[PDB]
Write a protein that binds this ligand. Structure first.
Ligand SMILES: Cc1cc2nc3c(=O)[nH]c(=O)nc-3n(C[C@H](O)[C@H](O)[C@H](O)COP(=O)(O)O)c2cc1C
Length: 306
């Protein structure tokens, strides 16, 4: 790392960011990601792990600037701007990558949010609105001019949704044009892909989303390879059990055993969706309606491999 990764005055411990994911990234999950190797975790706008990064979404420059102010007063150290989501509505208005079609609304939101807070302001985007409309370099150059201190690019256009494959050509081109740190994002699913994307794009950091849902330990696995060129062995079934059971217990404190078992069901189904999707345990665990039974059924499944 050439002097590590830095967002303003903040130097990150590593070049691995846990992607913001509305509904998924709760305080328990983000904390688990950070404990598992994430250099930074991003949360939703209205006592967190590492540097407190809160992402704001919306379409009105003034409303955006207020959300930035309210969340900094609430403890946010870094404010991020969502200009990436492909079907995001905020206060009934089209936000996210919808904003990428209009560089004038982009210019206005970035200017207003940057001069509202005395905190580093970052931007999360997409290639453009459609494959014919990739304005990636334009939006990156403008973000830098508005005072943005880091830029994340998911390698898909708004139209792409979650289809096909992410591309790193746009990311590579932006990094060569812009002076601010660029974060590569989209389909970074293992350490080898991560190294390949970092090498091709020349990016300052990597952002991983969906691959952390059923494998939160992927952050240390990717960091280890980037650092040493050596792979960490797969986490044995006993260590997985310890981590998943310590997490479901934490999900029974936060929100209580009433709403908790419902969340622990979500977070366990992500692990199950990745390590055993067409399984007998998946259907039976989702049927459970008691918090103590969930922990009992969880250690029952992991003991069959012992
Ligand atoms: C369920 C879900 C929720 C998401 N929510 C947000 C969000 O609130 N803000 C945002 O910028 N991106 C959001 N994303 C985009 C992720 O950051 C996205 O997965 C990442 O940008 C690229 O894909 P990856 O998971 O392969 O890294 C979301 C994605 C998913 C699948």
């Amino acid at each position: 790392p050439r002097g590590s990764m830095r967002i303003g005055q903040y130097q990150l411990r590593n070049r691995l960011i846990a992607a913001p994911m509305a509904g998924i990234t709760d305080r328990p999950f983000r904390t688990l990601c950070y404990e598992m190797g994430a250099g930074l975790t991003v949360s939703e706008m209205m006592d967190e792990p590492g540097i407190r990064t809160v992402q704001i979404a919306g379409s009105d420059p003034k409303e955006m600037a207020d959300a930035a102010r309210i969340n900094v007063e609430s403890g946010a150290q870094i404010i991020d701007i969502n200009m990436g989501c492909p079907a995001k509505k905020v206060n009934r208005k089209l936000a996210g990558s919808a904003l990428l079609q209009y560089p004038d609304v982009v210019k206005s939101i970035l200017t207003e949010v940057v001069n509202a807070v005395d905190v580093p302001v970052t931007l999360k985007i997409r290639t453009g609105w459609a494959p014919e409309h990739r304005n990636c370099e334009e939006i990156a150059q403008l973000a830098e001019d508005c005072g943005i201190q880091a830029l994340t690019i998911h390698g898909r256009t708004r139209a792409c949704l979650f289809n096909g494959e992410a591309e790193y050509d746009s990311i590579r081109a932006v990094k060569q044009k812009v002076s601010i740190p660029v974060i590569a994002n989209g389909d970074i699913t293992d350490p080898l892909k991560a190294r390949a994307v970092l090498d091709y794009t020349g990016a300052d950091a990597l952002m991983i989303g969906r691959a952390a849902q059923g494998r939160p330990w992927i952050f240390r696995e990717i960091q280890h390879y980037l650092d040493t060129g050596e792979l960490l062995p797969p986490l044995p079934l006993a260590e997985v059990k310890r981590l998943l059971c310590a997490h479901v217990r934490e999900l029974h404190d936060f929100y209580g055993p009433a709403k908790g078992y419902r969340i622990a069901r979500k977070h366990v189904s992500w692990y199950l969706q990745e390590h055993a999707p067409n399984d007998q345990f998946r259907r039976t665990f989702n049927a459970i309606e008691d918090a103590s039974e969930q922990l009992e059924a969880l250690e029952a499944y992991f003991e069959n491999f012992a």
